[PDB]
Homo-oligomer: A and B are copies of this chain.
Amino acid sequence: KPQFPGASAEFIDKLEFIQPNVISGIPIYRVMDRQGQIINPSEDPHLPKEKVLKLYKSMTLLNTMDRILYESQRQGRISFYMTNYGEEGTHVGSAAALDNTDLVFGQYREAGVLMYRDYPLELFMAQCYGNISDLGKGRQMPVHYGCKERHFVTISSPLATQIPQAVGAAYAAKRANANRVVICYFGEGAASEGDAHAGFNFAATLECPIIFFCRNNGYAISTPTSEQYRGDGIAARGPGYGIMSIRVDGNDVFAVYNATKEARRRAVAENQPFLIEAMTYRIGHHSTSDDSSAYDHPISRLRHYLLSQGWWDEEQEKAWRKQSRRKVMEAFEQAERKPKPNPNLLFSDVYQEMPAQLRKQQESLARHLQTYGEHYPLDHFDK
């Protein structure tokens, strides 16, 4: 018997390299087919009508908002935008499986999590416009949302940096005996970053109650997954770090819900990380800065399920399409009319307390504007 401290194994007397199983990878967990029918009753979560309607309406309201804000960006009303097309089911299905106080860390394409948590349309709009109502004070680019009240950590552009951070927050939760889980969303491209390796390893060695949720949509901007990795996606990486892993059909809200619900239950109970790789497809452009032509939908699937239960119909669909549009436009129009925040806000929150040298720079700007103000858009900014 081998006595090496680094591994637990038996000896082998023949040379055999271990081959990866990529052609026949980890299977994709699916609850309902493309016609919205439950394939295996034992897997039905039997979520109540009100809950399933919330999943549907959250997904569709987000799609409505995306269409409007994407257009707003094309018109130059907002400086940037990133849509969530084809991925709405991964957001709402997973959010619905969490407790509303579970802390969320994301990448930038998980707005459905906030929508499900009832983040006001006014606040999504305020951040995109950088107006006075933005709790982010107009400092970050559009779609860089955050909400302390709804336990959603402010998004940041550097990819994967939130991964080891989510792990630290999960360790702190464990210590606090909170009975809370941390969920951390990222794309398959971000998974290539060194910080993903850091986070996955730390969560396992430090025994953290965290769910790693990977959105595998087939592309990282123009890069197909064939140029991103050569192993069996991201799910296959989990076991090597000692992390319980699973792959699910991201276009199936129920499969996503089921996997997230089980991962949460066990993560909290056992203080152990879980990895969920949700397979989808990035239907829209990577962003408003991208023209995807240069290189099975979650909403329709759930709609067919709803019809099958007698829970929706063409008339209700039409009325909701109308109401959602009115709601988004109302918030949109309000957001556009609001002034931007006071330019003085460019200097606060750098440190908790403003250093004297920083206040001197703030005063410098004030004096500058007193003399050269006509050359600045002062009329569009507060005070």
Contacts and interface: CB of A to CB of B under 8 A. Distances in A.
A12 B229 CA distance: 23
B6 A30 contact: no
A29 B15 contact: yes
B4 A279 contact: yes
B197 A16 contact: no
A86 B121 CA distance: 64
A8 B227 CA distance: 15
Copies of this chain per assembly: 2
A247 B15 CA distance: 9
| Interface size of A as a range | 35 or more
Given A205-B227, A240-B231, A24 B40 contact: no
A276 to B, nearest CB: 9
Contacts of A20: 238-244
- Of all A-B residue pairs in the complex, the 4 with the closest CB atoms, nearest first, are A194-B194, A230-B242, A197-B197, A12-B27
Interface of A: 2-31, 39-40, 42-43, 188, 192-198, 201, 204-205, 216-219, 224-225, 227-233, 235-247, 249, 258-259, 262-263, 274, 277, 279-281, 296
Given A11-B30, A11-B249, A232-B242, 13 more contacts: A4-B279, A5-B219, A6-B233, A7-B25, A7-B279, A8-B22, A9-B28, A17-B263, A17-B274, A18-B245, A194-B198, A231-B242, A240-B240
